[PDB]
Coordinates of N, CA and C and ligand atoms in Angstrom, one line a residue:
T1 N 100.5 63.4 152.8 CA 100.3 62.0 152.3 C 101.6 61.2 152.3
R2 N 101.6 60.0 152.8 CA 102.7 59.1 152.9 C 103.1 58.7 151.5
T3 N 104.4 58.5 151.2 CA 105.0 58.0 150.0 C 105.8 56.8 150.2
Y4 N 105.9 56.0 149.2 CA 106.5 54.6 149.2 C 107.4 54.3 148.1
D5 N 108.4 53.5 148.3 CA 109.2 53.0 147.1 C 108.4 51.8 146.5
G6 N 108.9 51.3 145.4 CA 108.2 50.3 144.6 C 107.9 49.0 145.3
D7 N 108.7 48.7 146.4 CA 108.5 47.5 147.3 C 107.6 47.8 148.5
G8 N 106.9 49.0 148.5 CA 105.9 49.3 149.5 C 106.5 49.8 150.8
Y9 N 107.8 50.1 150.9 CA 108.4 50.7 152.1 C 108.1 52.2 152.1
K10 N 107.7 52.7 153.3 CA 107.4 54.1 153.4 C 108.8 54.8 153.2
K11 N 108.8 55.9 152.5 CA 110.0 56.8 152.3 C 110.1 57.8 153.4
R12 N 111.2 57.8 154.1 CA 111.4 58.8 155.2 C 112.8 59.5 155.0
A13 N 113.0 60.6 155.7 CA 114.3 61.3 155.7 C 114.5 61.8 157.2
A14 N 115.7 61.9 157.5 CA 116.1 62.3 158.9 C 117.5 63.0 158.8
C15 N 117.8 63.7 159.8 CA 119.2 64.2 160.0 C 119.7 63.9 161.4
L16 N 121.0 63.7 161.4 CA 121.9 63.7 162.6 C 122.3 65.1 162.7
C17 N 121.7 65.8 163.7 CA 121.8 67.2 163.9 C 122.9 67.4 164.9
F18 N 124.1 67.8 164.5 CA 125.3 68.0 165.3 C 125.4 69.4 165.8
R19 N 126.0 69.6 167.0 CA 126.1 70.9 167.7 C 127.3 71.7 167.0
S20 N 128.2 71.0 166.3 CA 129.4 71.5 165.7 C 130.0 70.6 164.7
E21 N 130.9 71.1 163.9 CA 131.6 70.2 162.8 C 132.4 69.1 163.4
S22 N 132.6 69.1 164.8 CA 133.3 68.0 165.4 C 132.4 66.7 165.5
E23 N 131.1 66.9 165.3 CA 130.1 65.7 165.3 C 130.2 64.9 166.6
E24 N 130.4 65.5 167.7 CA 130.5 64.9 169.0 C 129.2 64.8 169.8
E25 N 128.3 65.7 169.5 CA 127.0 65.9 170.2 C 125.9 66.0 169.2
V26 N 124.8 65.3 169.4 CA 123.7 65.2 168.5 C 122.4 65.4 169.2
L27 N 121.5 66.0 168.4 CA 120.2 66.4 169.0 C 119.2 65.3 168.8
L28 N 118.6 64.7 169.8 CA 117.5 63.8 169.8 C 116.3 64.5 170.2
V29 N 115.1 64.0 169.9 CA 113.8 64.5 170.3 C 113.0 63.4 170.9
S30 N 112.0 63.8 171.7 CA 111.1 62.8 172.4 C 110.2 62.1 171.4
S31 N 109.9 60.8 171.6 CA 108.9 60.1 170.9 C 107.5 60.7 171.1
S32 N 106.7 60.8 170.1 CA 105.4 61.4 170.1 C 104.5 60.5 171.0
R33 N 104.5 59.2 170.8 CA 103.6 58.2 171.6 C 104.2 58.0 173.0
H34 N 105.5 58.2 173.3 CA 106.1 57.8 174.5 C 107.1 58.9 175.0
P35 N 106.7 59.9 175.6 CA 107.5 61.1 175.9 C 108.9 60.8 176.6
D36 N 109.0 59.7 177.3 CA 110.1 59.3 178.1 C 111.2 58.6 177.2
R37 N 110.9 58.4 175.9 CA 111.9 57.8 174.9 C 112.4 58.8 174.0
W38 N 113.6 58.6 173.5 CA 114.4 59.4 172.5 C 114.4 58.8 171.2
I39 N 114.3 59.6 170.1 CA 114.4 59.2 168.7 C 115.3 60.2 168.0
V40 N 115.7 59.8 166.8 CA 116.3 60.8 165.8 C 115.2 61.4 165.0
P41 N 115.1 62.8 165.0 CA 114.1 63.5 164.2 C 114.1 63.1 162.7
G42 N 112.9 63.0 162.2 CA 112.7 62.5 160.8 C 111.2 62.3 160.6
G43 N 111.0 62.0 159.3 CA 109.6 61.7 158.9 C 109.4 61.5 157.4
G44 N 108.2 61.4 157.0 CA 107.8 61.0 155.7 C 108.2 62.0 154.6
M45 N 108.7 61.6 153.5 CA 108.9 62.4 152.3 C 107.5 62.6 151.7
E46 N 107.3 63.8 151.1 CA 106.1 64.1 150.4 C 106.3 63.8 148.9
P47 N 105.2 63.7 148.1 CA 105.3 63.4 146.7 C 106.3 64.3 146.0
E48 N 107.2 63.7 145.2 CA 108.3 64.4 144.4 C 109.2 65.3 145.3
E49 N 109.3 65.0 146.6 CA 110.1 65.8 147.5 C 111.5 65.2 147.5
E50 N 112.6 66.0 147.3 CA 113.9 65.5 147.3 C 114.2 65.0 148.7
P51 N 114.9 63.9 149.0 CA 115.2 63.4 150.3 C 115.9 64.5 151.2
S52 N 116.8 65.2 150.6 CA 117.6 66.2 151.4 C 116.6 67.3 151.8
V53 N 115.6 67.6 151.0 CA 114.6 68.7 151.3 C 113.7 68.2 152.4
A54 N 113.3 66.9 152.4 CA 112.4 66.3 153.4 C 113.1 66.3 154.7
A55 N 114.4 65.9 154.7 CA 115.2 65.7 155.9 C 115.3 67.1 156.7
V56 N 115.5 68.1 156.0 CA 115.7 69.5 156.6 C 114.3 70.0 157.1
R57 N 113.3 69.7 156.3 CA 111.9 70.1 156.7 C 111.5 69.4 158.0
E58 N 111.7 68.1 158.1 CA 111.2 67.3 159.2 C 112.0 67.7 160.5
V59 N 113.3 68.0 160.4 CA 114.0 68.4 161.6 C 113.7 69.8 162.0
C60 N 113.3 70.7 161.1 CA 112.7 72.0 161.5 C 111.4 71.7 162.3
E61 N 110.5 70.9 161.7 CA 109.1 70.6 162.3 C 109.3 70.0 163.7
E62 N 110.2 69.0 163.8 CA 110.2 68.1 165.0 C 111.2 68.6 166.0
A63 N 112.4 69.2 165.6 CA 113.5 69.5 166.5 C 113.7 71.1 166.6
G64 N 113.1 71.8 165.7 CA 113.2 73.3 165.8 C 114.6 73.8 165.6
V65 N 115.3 73.1 164.7 CA 116.7 73.5 164.3 C 116.8 73.6 162.8
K66 N 117.7 74.5 162.3 CA 118.1 74.6 160.9 C 119.6 74.6 160.9
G67 N 120.2 74.3 159.8 CA 121.7 74.4 159.7 C 122.2 74.0 158.3
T68 N 123.4 73.7 158.2 CA 124.2 73.4 156.9 C 124.1 71.9 156.7
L69 N 123.4 71.5 155.6 CA 123.3 70.1 155.3 C 124.6 69.6 154.8
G70 N 125.0 68.4 155.4 CA 126.2 67.7 155.0 C 125.9 66.5 154.2
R71 N 126.8 65.5 154.3 CA 126.7 64.3 153.5 C 125.5 63.4 153.8
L72 N 125.0 62.6 152.8 CA 124.2 61.5 153.1 C 125.0 60.4 153.8
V73 N 124.5 59.9 154.9 CA 125.2 58.8 155.6 C 124.8 57.5 154.9
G74 N 123.6 57.3 154.7 CA 123.1 56.1 154.1 C 121.6 56.0 154.0
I75 N 121.1 54.9 153.5 CA 119.6 54.7 153.5 C 119.4 53.5 154.4
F76 N 118.5 53.6 155.4 CA 118.4 52.6 156.5 C 117.0 52.0 156.5
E77 N 116.8 50.7 156.4 CA 115.5 50.1 156.4 C 115.2 49.6 157.8
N78 N 113.9 49.8 158.2 CA 113.3 49.1 159.3 C 112.4 48.0 158.7
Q79 N 112.9 46.8 158.7 CA 112.2 45.6 158.1 C 110.8 45.4 158.8
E80 N 110.8 45.5 160.1 CA 109.6 45.3 161.0 C 108.5 46.3 160.6
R81 N 108.8 47.6 160.5 CA 107.9 48.7 160.4 C 107.8 49.1 158.9
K82 N 108.5 48.5 158.0 CA 108.5 48.6 156.5 C 108.7 50.1 156.2
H83 N 109.9 50.6 156.5 CA 110.2 52.0 156.0 C 111.7 52.1 155.8
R84 N 112.1 53.0 154.9 CA 113.5 53.2 154.4 C 113.7 54.7 154.6
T85 N 114.8 55.0 155.4 CA 115.1 56.4 155.8 C 116.4 56.9 155.2
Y86 N 116.4 58.0 154.4 CA 117.6 58.6 154.0 C 118.1 59.5 155.3
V87 N 119.3 59.3 155.7 CA 119.9 59.9 156.9 C 121.1 60.8 156.5
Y88 N 120.9 62.1 156.8 CA 122.0 63.1 156.4 C 122.6 63.7 157.7
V89 N 123.9 64.1 157.6 CA 124.5 65.0 158.6 C 123.9 66.4 158.4
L90 N 123.6 67.1 159.5 CA 123.2 68.5 159.5 C 124.0 69.2 160.6
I91 N 124.8 70.2 160.3 CA 125.5 71.0 161.3 C 124.6 72.2 161.7
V92 N 124.2 72.2 163.0 CA 123.1 73.1 163.4 C 123.7 74.5 163.5
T93 N 122.9 75.5 162.8 CA 123.3 76.9 162.9 C 122.2 77.8 163.4
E94 N 121.0 77.2 163.6 CA 119.9 78.0 164.2 C 119.1 77.1 165.2
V95 N 118.9 77.5 166.4 CA 118.1 76.8 167.5 C 116.9 77.7 167.7
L96 N 115.7 77.3 167.3 CA 114.5 78.1 167.4 C 113.7 77.7 168.7
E97 N 113.0 78.6 169.3 CA 112.5 78.4 170.7 C 111.1 77.8 170.7
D98 N 110.2 78.1 169.7 CA 108.8 77.7 169.8 C 108.4 77.0 168.6
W99 N 108.9 75.8 168.3 CA 108.9 75.2 167.0 C 107.6 74.3 166.9
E100 N 107.2 73.9 165.7 CA 105.9 73.3 165.4 C 105.6 72.2 166.5
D101 N 106.5 71.2 166.7 CA 106.1 70.1 167.6 C 106.2 70.5 169.0
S102 N 107.0 71.5 169.4 CA 107.0 72.0 170.8 C 105.6 72.5 171.1
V103 N 105.1 73.4 170.2 CA 103.8 74.0 170.4 C 102.7 73.0 170.4
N104 N 102.7 72.1 169.4 CA 101.5 71.3 169.0 C 101.4 70.0 169.9
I105 N 102.6 69.4 170.2 CA 102.5 68.1 171.0 C 103.4 68.0 172.2
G106 N 104.1 69.1 172.5 CA 105.0 69.2 173.6 C 106.3 68.4 173.4
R107 N 106.7 68.2 172.2 CA 108.0 67.5 171.9 C 109.2 68.2 172.6
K108 N 110.0 67.4 173.2 CA 111.3 67.8 173.8 C 112.5 67.5 172.9
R109 N 113.6 68.2 173.1 CA 114.9 68.0 172.4 C 116.0 68.1 173.5
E110 N 117.1 67.4 173.2 CA 118.2 67.3 174.1 C 119.5 66.9 173.3
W111 N 120.6 67.5 173.7 CA 121.9 67.2 173.1 C 122.5 65.9 173.8
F112 N 123.0 65.0 173.1 CA 123.6 63.7 173.6 C 125.0 63.6 173.0
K113 N 126.0 63.2 173.8 CA 127.2 62.7 173.2 C 126.9 61.5 172.4
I114 N 127.6 61.3 171.3 CA 127.3 60.1 170.3 C 127.1 58.8 171.1
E115 N 128.0 58.5 172.1 CA 127.9 57.2 172.8 C 126.6 57.1 173.5
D116 N 126.1 58.2 174.1 CA 124.9 58.2 174.9 C 123.7 58.1 174.0
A117 N 123.7 58.8 172.8 CA 122.6 58.7 171.8 C 122.4 57.2 171.4
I118 N 123.5 56.6 171.1 CA 123.5 55.1 170.7 C 122.8 54.4 171.9
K119 N 123.2 54.6 173.1 CA 122.7 53.9 174.3 C 121.1 54.1 174.4
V120 N 120.7 55.3 174.3 CA 119.2 55.6 174.6 C 118.4 55.1 173.3
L121 N 119.0 55.0 172.2 CA 118.2 54.5 171.0 C 118.1 53.0 170.9
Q122 N 119.1 52.3 171.4 CA 119.3 50.8 171.2 C 118.0 50.0 171.4
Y123 N 117.3 50.2 172.5 CA 116.3 49.3 172.9 C 115.1 49.3 172.0
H124 N 114.5 50.5 171.7 CA 113.3 50.6 170.9 C 113.6 51.0 169.4
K125 N 114.8 51.6 169.2 CA 115.1 52.1 167.9 C 116.5 51.7 167.4
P126 N 116.8 50.3 167.4 CA 118.1 49.9 167.1 C 118.6 50.3 165.7
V127 N 117.6 50.5 164.7 CA 118.1 50.9 163.4 C 118.6 52.4 163.5
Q128 N 117.9 53.2 164.3 CA 118.4 54.6 164.5 C 119.7 54.6 165.3
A129 N 119.9 53.7 166.2 CA 121.3 53.6 166.8 C 122.3 53.3 165.7
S130 N 122.0 52.5 164.8 CA 122.9 52.1 163.7 C 123.2 53.2 162.8
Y131 N 122.4 54.3 162.8 CA 122.8 55.5 161.9 C 124.2 56.0 162.3
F132 N 124.6 55.8 163.6 CA 125.8 56.3 164.1 C 127.0 55.4 163.9
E133 N 126.9 54.2 163.3 CA 128.0 53.2 163.3 C 129.2 53.7 162.5
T134 N 128.9 54.4 161.4 CA 130.0 54.9 160.4 C 130.4 56.3 160.7
Ligands
U71_1 O1 103.9 53.4 165.6 P1 104.5 54.3 166.7 O2 105.4 53.4 167.6 O3 103.6 55.3 167.4 O4 105.6 55.1 165.9 C1 105.3 56.2 165.0 C2 105.2 55.7 163.5 O5 106.5 55.0 163.2 P2 106.6 53.5 162.6 O6 105.5 52.7 163.5 O7 106.2 53.6 161.2 O8 108.0 53.1 162.9 C3 105.1 56.9 162.6 O9 105.0 56.5 161.2 P3 103.7 56.0 160.5 O10 103.8 54.5 160.9 O11 103.9 56.2 159.0 O12 102.5 56.7 161.1 C4 106.2 57.9 162.8 O13 106.0 59.0 161.9 P4 107.2 59.4 161.0 O14 108.4 60.0 161.7 O15 107.6 58.3 160.0 O16 106.4 60.5 160.0 P5 106.1 62.1 160.2 O17 107.3 62.7 161.0 O18 106.1 62.6 158.7 O19 104.8 62.1 160.9 C5 106.2 58.4 164.2 O20 107.2 59.4 164.5 P6 106.9 60.9 165.0 O21 105.4 60.9 165.5 O22 107.0 61.8 163.8 O23 107.9 61.0 166.0 C6 106.4 57.2 165.2 O24 106.4 57.7 166.5 P7 107.7 57.8 167.5 O25 107.9 59.2 167.7 O26 108.8 57.2 166.8 O27 107.2 57.1 168.8
CL2 CL1 129.4 68.5 168.1
CL3 CL1 113.7 52.9 163.0
F4 F1 105.8 64.9 160.1
MG5 MG1 107.3 64.7 161.3
MG6 MG1 108.6 61.9 162.4
MG7 MG1 105.8 64.6 158.2

């Protein structure tokens, strides 16, 4: 079930999943509706679910990775689609081979240099590109 803040924005969480503590390469996943497009993995918080817990759950489900949770980067609103996403750094320590969204919907994942992740997110997902600004 979807959850909302008091202003009716959907509550989401996501991680910037980095290959190493250098934070130079990040894992993107394919769009569910548009396989040829890249997104930052993330999704809806469940009722009473801590944002850090939702973030780590969604990137397990969507990207098939686990790791060491880092700092909250910020909370990012998509005015058009009415959602607010808590975005965390995650340093990846496990890459799993047959993860929920690989099996269920054929979701892909790929490592991008930060500059290239910003480039592929800008057109359809400019707020996700902005996750990388700081
Ligand atoms: O409407 P669409 O363009 O098909 O977008 C979809 C909606 O996003 P949005 O329209 O709200 O921006 C949807 O969210 P809902 O609108 O609540 O269905 C959102 O799912 P999300 O990641 O928020 O949730 P979850 O991962 O928990 O399913 C979904 O993400 P996901 O299926 O998990 O990758 C978006 O699909 P996308 O992969 O970004 O192409
Ligand atoms: Cl890295
Ligand atoms: Cl967005
Ligand atoms: F989900
Ligand atoms: Mg999801
Ligand atoms: Mg999602
Ligand atoms: Mg979900």
